Amino acid sequence: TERIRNVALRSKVCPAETASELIKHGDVVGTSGFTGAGYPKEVPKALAQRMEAAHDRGEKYQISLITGASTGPQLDGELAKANGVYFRSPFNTDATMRNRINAGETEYFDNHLGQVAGRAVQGNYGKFNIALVEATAITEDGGIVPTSSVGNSQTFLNLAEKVIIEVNEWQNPMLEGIHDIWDGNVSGVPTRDIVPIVRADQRVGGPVLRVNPDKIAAIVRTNDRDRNAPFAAPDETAKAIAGYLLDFFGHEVKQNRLPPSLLPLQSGVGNVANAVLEGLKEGPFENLVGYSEVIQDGMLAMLDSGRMRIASASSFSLSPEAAEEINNRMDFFRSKIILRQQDVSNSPGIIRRLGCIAMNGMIEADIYGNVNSTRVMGSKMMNGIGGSGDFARSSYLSIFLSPSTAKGGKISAIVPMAAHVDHIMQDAQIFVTEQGLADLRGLSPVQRAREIISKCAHPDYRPMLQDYFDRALKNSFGKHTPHLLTEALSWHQRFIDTGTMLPS
Amino acid sequence: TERIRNVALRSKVCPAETASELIKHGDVVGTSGFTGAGYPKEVPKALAQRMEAAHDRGEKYQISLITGASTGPQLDGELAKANGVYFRSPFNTDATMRNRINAGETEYFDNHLGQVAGRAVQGNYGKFNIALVEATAITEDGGIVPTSSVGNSQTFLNLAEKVIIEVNEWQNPMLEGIHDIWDGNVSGVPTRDIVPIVRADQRVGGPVLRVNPDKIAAIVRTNDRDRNAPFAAPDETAKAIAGYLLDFFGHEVKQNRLPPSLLPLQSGVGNVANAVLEGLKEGPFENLVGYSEVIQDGMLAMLDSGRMRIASASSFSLSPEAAEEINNRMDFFRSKIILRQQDVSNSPGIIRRLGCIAMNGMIEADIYGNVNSTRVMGSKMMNGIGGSGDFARSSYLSIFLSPSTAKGGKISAIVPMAAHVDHIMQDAQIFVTEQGLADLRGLSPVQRAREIISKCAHPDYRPMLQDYFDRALKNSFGKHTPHLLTEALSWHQRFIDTGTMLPSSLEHHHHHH
Ligand SMILES: *SCCNC(=O)CCNC(=O)[C@H](O)C(C)(C)COP(=O)(O)OP(=O)(O)OC[C@H]1O[C@@H](n2cnc3c(N)ncnc32)[C@H](O)[C@@H]1OP(=O)(O)O
Ligand SMILES: CC(C)(COP(=O)(O)OP(=O)(O)OC[C@H]1O[C@@H](n2cnc3c(N)ncnc32)[C@H](O)[C@@H]1OP(=O)(O)O)[C@@H](O)C(=O)NCCC(=O)NCCS
Ligand SMILES: [Cl-]
Ligand SMILES: [Cl-]
Ligand SMILES: [Cl-]
Ligand SMILES: [Cl-]
């Protein structure tokens, strides 16, 4: 059938190439796109080709690119290859863009995801010249139906001088109805409105993004797919991690520190997460509820098994198999999923009110339980902080999960001092590795260290950590959080120098 | 007249020493007390004495002490002197207690102030045996009127097995009515209640703390003053910082990024604050509003002048001459002030909704604008994170202010890498020192560094900082946040070893050329 149901807006249809010409060197461009879902695809490719051409002619041609979160090859990839992004925010997972960032070729700032809309309204990224947004359809009354994520799209539409819409036939038409877009003041000028959400399942808005049709300068009909998560399954390391956490939850319920149905669940991006969700799929906790940033394979499975009743998120992140599963049964799943603006899904006010349990991955933690989520050796960007801070600090319980080692045992995920900190001690109560679980609630830093070292550290590294800690306790400037500054970062330098943190 | 207006409770009145006997070795004790205001005084003194006696006889006697925030000499001081505290949370400014913490004699964890109540209810500190709370009065129906702070007192009252009240006749009776205590679910079991505050001057509750009178085991009549620590008159460094900040505010207003009345202001604990507040009282900005953790001298002044229309906080933080002024006019100041539970004053939902401007001190920041508020050389506690995280992360604008050097120039407040992090780059947008102001909005880390180094760092240190940065850019494992791990913490180690961050010219340093 026809995706552009507003007749007058059909007159605005044009080629991706023509549309890209609307984007000028220096422009700030806000796009849809979150966890590889729902980003614009055709216009960016054409922009990319035109950028390389201009460069070869000695013509400066770059943009600032603000998204919901991560995109995909068509967007971050192509623009990165063309060397056409001078600034990027707030979250990337594309390899080429990552290389531009780590080479100092593209400036990057990974804002808390729930804050981006507000900072954009404040003007932190500059004036938005363009909003480039992917849509499933356009309603008769000119509503824009989003695709597989909401992200920041409503805000970008509000802000931008000109609007380009990509309407993508690839996206399932039955997405229409799944989203909840609130017309309230969440990220606008203070004083903001109270967001009246008191239950994860509660809808407070409507199914479409709103925009003034006068701002729409081009509509481009497209047909191309989102990225998929890898299908692969959780290994023995992940399963052990899931096992410790599930036992922990069990003991909390017995002590009456959690209800039998737990609390609204936030599961982060990563593979350790899927182990946990798979664990919960066949777990003893019924009538679960998700209040997260993303719907991954694991959550989809739990909605399937009925072990989870409903899930709130801003986006999808699904394997091709999971994607197929949902696109066949969209009517079933649609009644169990709510996609929200990311400034609502990641609202600290709402997260705390609902009492979410936050479960996130990490690069590394130090012995005191400070967490690095982002910067390897302190300087090389992986993905970004994303929403891990939004959730960790606001949660009822903040949990970080990781293999105790990386790179085949050549790196310890528990270190004397983190090379970069994303989450301070105060924002992390529980740590889990395949070695065990450390419950840090109510503990001082020295007490946190004893737990983390004995429970979580790999046997190969535990004695080295105990050696560091003992000598710090003896020789540190202060004894509240004992360190030896001459060796605090020495394991990282050793990896840099030798390829392993294990001494020779 | 009587401060205890409920007849039935009068029979529970007893001497401080006797009340203190209710507190046993190993007890978890929650007390009133926030920034030198409203903490209990006589019972802790008596308790300290008995602890010392037990110790002298080889008998153990220590408590876990959980407060609103910092207390004063009568409580933190006396107990630390007696070595009577095995665990302390969440915030302390007493020098003796600080020494116990830094020697490893008292275990310490500085929780975000707005989260303490919820973590207590969750059971993180264990079961509360005693709540010890200072009061102005007890009402006819048994309500407890708090004194110069609210803090966590309501939560401690709810949780504790037994309750002790100190009724302090030094505290002005006209404090009654200044407090706003909510029966709503702010820090209890989820799902919590919506906290419906949509203006800084809005009251949502009532004037008294509520407690089952059956739990009140003792009441002590007292008469002793709060720790009205001395007014630190702003020096030229502080004034310069304030000048740059006020110029910034003026600019934001001129560019229509702030209303002429600014937005609700949070001013952190510290000495740079007085400069800022003094600057604001002379400034061009009218109809100001405070939504803060504390009310300090500078705020009282603007309330008196009408420059500030209302001030919301959990506590007072006044100089003796400031307690003096307000005492003579509590009648007047009571209509300009609202004292709230700290889980409400420091609620991230509310702070964001109101759009607070956060202004906080710091120990140090690295060139990328990560902030240390707590741990000198990374291991020695100063005060604690307090509510700086509550406010920094939730604010409309997050501003950190500090002298560019410390220890008479022997330490640079801008460093290659912070020795400890309290506020990540994402939580800090504006930096101000006496050297200038760095506006970091929309910048990548490398861009942040160029601004911080050029605007904020002291001239004595900027060449060294630029040298680090330049060489990191060339050599760092990654170029997103360039570091040289061999040197990152070397200025701190130089200070530990030699008492200065400055290099000795007797040896090479790449910036010396
Ligand atoms: S929406 C709310 C939550 N959002 C976030 O948490 C955003 C930030 N978090 C993330 O980016 C991921 O959670 C990270 C922290 C990268 C971990 O992801 P995983 O859970 O999938 O863990 P993996 O073991 O699979 O690691 C993935 C890649 O990261 C590398 N890595 C992990 N740990 C280290 C250490 N200590 N040192 C170096 N590298 C490390 C892994 O090597 C892996 O990368 P590869 O390129 O595949 O080797
Ligand atoms: C960080 C903090 C101590 C700074 O206080 P300040 O009055 O603004 O700054 P000052 O320059 O006067 O220095 C205060 C102390 O810190 C020390 N200090 C400051 N910077 C230092 C540095 N870079 N290295 C070593 N010591 C430093 C000073 O020497 C002084 O210590 P002293 O009493 O032993 O002489 C203070 O703001 C604080 O404790 N913050 C945490 C709580 C908070 O921010 N709450 C917010 C809501 S109220
Ligand atoms: Cl809200
Ligand atoms: Cl805790
Ligand atoms: Cl709320
Ligand atoms: Cl920003």
Short mmCIF file of C-alpha atoms in Angstrom, two decimals, chain B residues 20-396:
data_model
loop_
_atom_site.label_atom_id
_atom_site.label_comp_id
_atom_site.label_asym_id
_atom_site.label_seq_id
_atom_site.Cartn_x
_atom_site.Cartn_y
_atom_site.Cartn_z
CA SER B 20 23.25 7.91 76.73
CA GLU B 21 23.08 4.56 78.51
CA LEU B 22 20.42 3.42 76.03
CA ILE B 23 23.13 3.39 73.34
CA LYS B 24 25.04 0.13 73.33
CA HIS B 25 28.29 -1.13 71.86
CA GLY B 26 27.74 -2.05 68.22
CA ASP B 27 24.53 0.02 67.83
CA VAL B 28 23.63 1.71 64.55
CA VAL B 29 22.66 5.30 65.47
CA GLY B 30 20.94 7.77 63.14
CA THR B 31 21.06 11.44 64.20
CA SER B 32 19.86 14.86 63.13
CA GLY B 33 22.63 17.16 61.95
CA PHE B 34 23.56 18.86 58.70
CA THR B 35 26.40 21.33 57.98
CA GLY B 36 26.97 22.26 61.62
CA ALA B 37 23.26 22.71 62.31
CA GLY B 38 20.71 20.81 64.35
CA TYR B 39 22.79 17.87 65.52
CA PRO B 40 22.40 16.50 69.07
CA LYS B 41 24.94 17.79 71.58
CA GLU B 42 24.58 16.63 75.18
CA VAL B 43 23.90 12.93 74.69
CA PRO B 44 26.90 12.48 72.39
CA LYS B 45 29.16 14.26 74.93
CA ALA B 46 27.96 11.99 77.73
CA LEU B 47 28.29 8.97 75.44
CA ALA B 48 31.86 9.88 74.52
CA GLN B 49 32.82 10.06 78.20
CA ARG B 50 31.44 6.60 78.90
CA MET B 51 33.13 5.19 75.78
CA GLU B 52 36.50 6.53 76.96
CA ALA B 53 35.93 4.97 80.38
CA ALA B 54 35.13 1.59 78.86
CA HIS B 55 38.16 1.77 76.57
CA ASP B 56 40.47 2.64 79.46
CA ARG B 57 39.33 -0.65 81.05
CA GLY B 58 39.85 -2.76 77.94
CA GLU B 59 36.16 -2.78 77.09
CA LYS B 60 34.90 -2.25 73.51
CA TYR B 61 32.41 0.56 72.90
CA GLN B 62 31.80 1.88 69.41
CA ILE B 63 28.78 2.77 67.28
CA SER B 64 27.93 3.18 63.64
CA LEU B 65 26.94 6.81 63.21
CA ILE B 66 24.69 7.80 60.29
CA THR B 67 23.75 11.49 60.02
CA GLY B 68 22.08 14.04 57.75
CA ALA B 69 25.47 15.43 56.77
CA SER B 70 28.25 17.01 58.84
CA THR B 71 27.69 17.69 62.51
CA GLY B 72 29.90 19.64 64.94
CA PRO B 73 32.42 19.42 67.84
CA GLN B 74 29.85 18.07 70.32
CA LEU B 75 29.11 15.05 68.16
CA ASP B 76 31.69 14.14 65.51
CA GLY B 77 34.41 15.81 67.56
CA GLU B 78 33.69 14.20 70.93
CA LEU B 79 33.02 10.76 69.54
CA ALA B 80 36.15 10.82 67.33
CA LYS B 81 38.24 11.93 70.31
CA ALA B 82 36.91 8.92 72.22
CA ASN B 83 37.58 6.66 69.24
CA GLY B 84 33.93 5.63 69.54
CA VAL B 85 32.90 5.28 65.89
CA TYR B 86 33.51 2.13 63.89
CA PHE B 87 31.58 3.28 60.79
CA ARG B 88 30.52 6.77 59.65
CA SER B 89 28.24 8.01 56.85
CA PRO B 90 27.59 10.10 54.79
CA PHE B 91 29.45 13.40 55.33
CA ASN B 92 31.86 14.84 57.88
CA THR B 93 33.82 18.08 58.35
CA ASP B 94 35.22 17.51 61.85
CA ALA B 95 39.04 17.41 61.85
CA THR B 96 39.35 14.72 64.51
CA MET B 97 36.82 12.46 62.78
CA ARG B 98 38.64 13.15 59.52
CA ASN B 99 41.89 11.96 61.11
CA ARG B 100 40.22 8.73 62.33
CA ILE B 101 38.91 8.08 58.83
CA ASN B 102 42.29 8.75 57.17
CA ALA B 103 44.18 6.59 59.65
CA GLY B 104 41.79 3.69 59.00
CA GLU B 105 40.36 3.82 62.53
CA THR B 106 36.81 4.73 61.42
CA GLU B 107 35.31 3.12 58.27
CA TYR B 108 33.65 5.72 56.03
CA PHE B 109 31.41 5.87 52.95
CA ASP B 110 30.27 9.21 51.56
CA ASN B 111 26.93 8.41 49.88
CA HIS B 112 25.17 10.97 47.68
CA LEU B 113 23.23 13.00 50.26
CA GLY B 114 19.87 12.73 48.49
CA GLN B 115 20.20 8.92 48.46
CA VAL B 116 21.06 8.25 52.10
CA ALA B 117 17.46 7.91 53.30
CA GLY B 118 16.60 5.40 50.59
CA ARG B 119 19.70 3.31 51.23
CA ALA B 120 18.93 3.32 54.96
CA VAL B 121 15.39 2.08 54.25
CA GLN B 122 16.84 -0.55 51.94
CA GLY B 123 18.88 -1.80 54.91
CA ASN B 124 22.35 -0.85 53.62
CA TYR B 125 23.58 0.36 57.03
CA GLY B 126 21.82 -2.45 58.85
CA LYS B 127 19.07 -2.20 61.44
CA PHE B 128 18.80 1.15 63.16
CA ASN B 129 18.89 0.79 66.94
CA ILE B 130 18.70 4.44 67.91
CA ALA B 131 17.49 7.69 66.42
CA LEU B 132 18.88 10.72 68.25
CA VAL B 133 17.29 13.97 67.14
CA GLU B 134 17.43 17.60 68.27
CA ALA B 135 14.13 19.43 68.57
CA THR B 136 12.89 22.98 69.06
CA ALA B 137 9.68 21.79 70.66
CA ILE B 138 7.25 18.93 70.94
CA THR B 139 3.69 19.82 69.97
CA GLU B 140 0.44 19.01 71.78
CA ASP B 141 -0.18 16.01 69.50
CA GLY B 142 3.41 14.80 69.91
CA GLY B 143 4.89 16.18 66.69
CA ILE B 144 8.65 16.76 66.86
CA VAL B 145 9.61 20.25 65.68
CA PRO B 146 13.16 20.08 64.23
CA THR B 147 15.78 22.79 64.72
CA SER B 148 18.23 24.37 62.26
CA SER B 149 18.13 21.44 59.80
CA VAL B 150 15.84 18.62 58.69
CA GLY B 151 18.36 16.25 57.09
CA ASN B 152 17.37 12.59 57.35
CA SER B 153 15.60 12.95 60.68
CA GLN B 154 12.18 11.73 59.57
CA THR B 155 13.66 8.61 58.03
CA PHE B 156 15.76 7.84 61.11
CA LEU B 157 12.67 8.25 63.31
CA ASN B 158 10.72 5.81 61.14
CA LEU B 159 13.50 3.22 61.16
CA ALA B 160 14.88 3.26 64.72
CA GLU B 161 13.90 0.77 67.47
CA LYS B 162 14.27 3.45 70.12
CA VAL B 163 14.18 7.22 69.95
CA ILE B 164 15.93 9.90 72.01
CA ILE B 165 15.00 13.57 71.66
CA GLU B 166 17.09 16.57 72.77
CA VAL B 167 14.86 19.63 73.25
CA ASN B 168 17.23 22.59 72.81
CA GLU B 169 16.13 25.88 74.36
CA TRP B 170 18.94 27.70 72.58
CA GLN B 171 17.03 27.15 69.32
CA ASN B 172 14.51 29.90 68.56
CA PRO B 173 10.90 28.75 69.14
CA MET B 174 9.95 30.60 65.95
CA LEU B 175 11.68 27.91 63.89
CA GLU B 176 8.37 26.09 64.33
CA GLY B 177 6.61 26.45 60.97
CA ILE B 178 9.77 26.87 58.89
CA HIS B 179 10.09 23.15 58.10
CA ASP B 180 8.27 21.14 55.43
CA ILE B 181 8.06 17.40 56.23
CA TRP B 182 6.24 15.18 53.73
CA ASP B 183 4.48 11.92 54.57
CA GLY B 184 4.89 10.95 50.91
CA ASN B 185 6.93 8.01 49.67
CA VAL B 186 10.21 9.65 48.59
CA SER B 187 12.75 7.12 49.80
CA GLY B 188 10.61 4.11 50.71
CA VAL B 189 9.64 0.95 48.84
CA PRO B 190 8.96 1.31 45.11
CA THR B 191 6.92 2.31 43.45
CA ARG B 192 7.68 5.68 45.10
CA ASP B 193 5.34 8.67 44.98
CA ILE B 194 5.55 11.52 42.53
CA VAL B 195 7.05 14.43 44.45
CA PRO B 196 4.85 17.19 43.09
CA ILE B 197 7.19 20.15 43.63
CA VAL B 198 6.88 22.49 40.63
CA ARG B 199 8.15 25.69 42.30
CA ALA B 200 11.01 26.34 44.72
CA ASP B 201 8.71 27.94 47.31
CA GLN B 202 6.18 25.10 47.34
CA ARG B 203 5.32 23.29 50.59
CA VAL B 204 3.95 19.75 50.26
CA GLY B 205 3.79 18.62 53.86
CA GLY B 206 3.70 19.85 57.43
CA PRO B 207 5.78 21.48 60.19
CA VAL B 208 6.61 18.44 62.35
CA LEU B 209 8.45 15.13 62.26
CA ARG B 210 6.15 12.24 63.14
CA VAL B 211 7.02 9.34 65.44
CA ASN B 212 5.16 6.74 67.49
CA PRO B 213 5.47 8.13 71.01
CA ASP B 214 5.81 4.57 72.26
CA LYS B 215 9.31 4.48 70.68
CA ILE B 216 10.54 7.53 72.56
CA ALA B 217 12.73 6.19 75.33
CA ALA B 218 14.18 9.44 76.60
CA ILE B 219 13.96 13.20 76.29
CA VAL B 220 16.82 15.48 77.35
CA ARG B 221 16.45 19.20 77.99
CA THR B 222 19.43 21.05 76.57
CA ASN B 223 20.76 24.53 75.96
CA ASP B 224 23.79 24.64 73.67
CA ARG B 225 24.65 26.39 70.41
CA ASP B 226 25.26 25.00 66.90
CA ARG B 227 28.76 25.06 65.36
CA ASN B 228 28.54 28.50 63.79
CA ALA B 229 31.98 28.17 62.18
CA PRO B 230 33.74 31.50 61.43
CA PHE B 231 32.94 33.69 58.42
CA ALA B 232 35.72 33.40 55.86
CA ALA B 233 35.75 36.81 54.22
CA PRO B 234 36.34 36.41 50.46
CA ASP B 235 39.92 37.08 49.39
CA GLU B 236 40.99 38.57 46.06
CA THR B 237 41.14 35.09 44.55
CA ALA B 238 37.56 34.40 45.62
CA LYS B 239 36.37 37.79 44.33
CA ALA B 240 38.00 37.22 40.93
CA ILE B 241 36.29 33.87 40.60
CA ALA B 242 32.97 35.52 41.49
CA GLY B 243 33.57 38.31 38.98
CA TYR B 244 34.12 35.87 36.11
CA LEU B 245 31.03 33.89 37.12
CA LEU B 246 28.80 36.99 37.28
CA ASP B 247 30.10 38.13 33.86
CA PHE B 248 29.13 34.72 32.52
CA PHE B 249 25.63 34.94 33.99
CA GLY B 250 25.25 38.44 32.54
CA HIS B 251 26.26 37.10 29.14
CA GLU B 252 23.83 34.17 29.22
CA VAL B 253 21.02 36.57 30.06
CA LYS B 254 22.07 38.95 27.24
CA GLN B 255 21.99 35.98 24.85
CA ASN B 256 18.61 34.86 26.15
CA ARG B 257 19.88 31.54 27.48
CA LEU B 258 18.83 32.51 31.02
CA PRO B 259 15.97 34.68 32.27
CA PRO B 260 16.99 37.95 33.96
CA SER B 261 16.04 36.31 37.27
CA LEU B 262 18.36 33.40 36.40
CA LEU B 263 17.08 30.00 37.61
CA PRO B 264 16.89 28.37 41.05
CA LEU B 265 20.39 28.50 42.53
CA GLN B 266 22.31 25.81 44.39
CA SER B 267 25.43 27.03 46.14
CA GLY B 268 27.72 24.39 47.58
CA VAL B 269 29.55 24.34 50.89
CA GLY B 270 32.80 26.33 50.77
CA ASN B 271 34.46 29.80 50.79
CA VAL B 272 34.15 30.64 47.10
CA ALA B 273 30.41 30.67 47.70
CA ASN B 274 30.45 33.84 49.78
CA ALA B 275 32.16 35.70 46.96
CA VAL B 276 29.57 34.41 44.49
CA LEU B 277 26.66 35.21 46.80
CA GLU B 278 28.13 38.62 47.69
CA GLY B 279 28.60 39.26 44.00
CA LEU B 280 24.99 38.30 43.37
CA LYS B 281 23.67 40.68 46.02
CA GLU B 282 25.44 43.61 44.36
CA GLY B 283 24.70 42.27 40.89
CA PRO B 284 22.07 43.24 38.29
CA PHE B 285 19.96 40.11 38.69
CA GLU B 286 16.61 40.48 40.46
CA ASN B 287 13.98 38.13 41.83
CA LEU B 288 16.47 35.33 42.55
CA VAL B 289 15.44 31.99 44.01
CA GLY B 290 17.43 29.44 46.00
CA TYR B 291 16.88 25.71 45.66
CA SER B 292 19.91 24.43 47.44
CA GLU B 293 21.23 22.02 50.05
CA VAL B 294 22.21 24.76 52.50
CA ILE B 295 21.45 28.41 53.30
CA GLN B 296 24.58 30.42 54.01
CA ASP B 297 25.39 34.01 55.06
CA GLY B 298 25.21 35.33 51.49
CA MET B 299 21.70 33.98 50.96
CA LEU B 300 20.32 35.50 54.19
CA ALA B 301 21.59 38.86 52.96
CA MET B 302 19.75 38.70 49.66
CA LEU B 303 16.60 37.51 51.38
CA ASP B 304 16.82 40.51 53.70
CA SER B 305 17.36 42.87 50.77
CA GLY B 306 14.69 41.27 48.61
CA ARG B 307 17.26 40.35 45.96
CA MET B 308 16.35 36.70 46.63
CA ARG B 309 12.60 36.04 47.02
CA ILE B 310 12.75 32.59 48.64
CA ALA B 311 15.39 30.05 49.67
CA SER B 312 14.80 26.31 49.91
CA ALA B 313 17.31 24.00 51.59
CA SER B 314 17.66 21.18 54.10
CA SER B 315 19.85 23.17 56.49
CA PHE B 316 21.42 26.43 57.66
CA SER B 317 25.16 26.98 57.29
CA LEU B 318 25.68 30.27 59.09
CA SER B 319 28.42 32.20 60.87
CA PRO B 320 27.85 33.14 64.53
CA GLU B 321 26.99 36.70 63.51
CA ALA B 322 24.59 35.13 61.01
CA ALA B 323 22.83 32.94 63.57
CA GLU B 324 22.66 36.15 65.58
CA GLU B 325 20.90 38.19 62.90
CA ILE B 326 18.40 35.45 62.03
CA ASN B 327 17.65 34.78 65.70
CA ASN B 328 16.61 38.40 66.23
CA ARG B 329 14.37 38.18 63.16
CA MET B 330 13.42 34.50 62.80
CA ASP B 331 9.95 36.01 62.67
CA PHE B 332 10.90 37.64 59.37
CA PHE B 333 13.22 35.02 57.88
CA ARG B 334 10.72 32.23 58.55
CA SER B 335 8.57 33.59 55.72
CA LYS B 336 11.46 33.56 53.23
CA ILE B 337 12.82 30.08 53.86
CA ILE B 338 11.70 26.50 53.56
CA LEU B 339 13.66 23.71 55.22
CA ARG B 340 13.05 20.30 53.59
CA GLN B 341 14.05 16.67 54.12
CA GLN B 342 17.38 16.20 52.33
CA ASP B 343 15.92 13.46 50.14
CA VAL B 344 13.65 16.21 48.78
CA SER B 345 16.10 19.13 48.67
CA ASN B 346 18.51 16.77 46.89
CA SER B 347 15.99 14.95 44.66
CA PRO B 348 17.31 14.57 41.09
CA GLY B 349 13.77 14.62 39.70
CA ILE B 350 13.04 17.98 41.32
CA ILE B 351 16.44 19.54 40.65
CA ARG B 352 16.11 18.77 36.92
CA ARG B 353 12.47 19.87 36.71
CA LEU B 354 13.19 23.23 38.36
CA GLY B 355 16.29 23.65 36.19
CA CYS B 356 18.70 24.46 38.98
CA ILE B 357 22.04 26.12 38.39
CA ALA B 358 24.65 24.18 40.38
CA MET B 359 27.76 25.90 41.72
CA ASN B 360 30.22 23.74 43.60
CA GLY B 361 33.80 23.75 44.85
CA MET B 362 36.43 21.16 43.97
CA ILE B 363 39.82 19.79 44.99
CA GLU B 364 41.05 19.48 41.44
CA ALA B 365 40.10 18.82 37.83
CA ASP B 366 42.18 17.18 35.14
CA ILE B 367 42.71 18.77 31.73
CA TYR B 368 39.67 16.88 30.42
CA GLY B 369 37.44 18.33 33.14
CA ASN B 370 36.90 15.30 35.34
CA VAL B 371 36.42 16.55 38.90
CA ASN B 372 37.75 15.42 42.30
CA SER B 373 35.72 16.80 45.23
CA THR B 374 37.02 14.52 47.97
CA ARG B 375 40.29 12.62 47.96
CA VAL B 376 43.65 14.42 48.12
CA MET B 377 46.36 12.50 46.25
CA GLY B 378 43.46 10.12 45.64
CA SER B 379 43.61 8.49 49.08
CA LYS B 380 43.16 11.09 51.81
CA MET B 381 39.55 12.12 52.53
CA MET B 382 38.70 15.81 52.93
CA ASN B 383 34.92 16.15 53.58
CA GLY B 384 32.91 13.98 51.18
CA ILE B 385 30.99 14.15 47.91
CA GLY B 386 27.93 15.51 49.77
CA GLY B 387 25.17 16.67 47.41
CA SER B 388 27.56 17.85 44.69
CA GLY B 389 26.69 14.79 42.61
CA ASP B 390 22.97 15.12 43.27
CA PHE B 391 23.13 18.64 41.90
CA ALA B 392 25.89 18.46 39.26
CA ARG B 393 24.29 15.62 37.30
CA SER B 394 20.70 16.87 37.57
CA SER B 395 21.30 20.61 37.03
CA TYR B 396 20.43 22.82 34.06
#
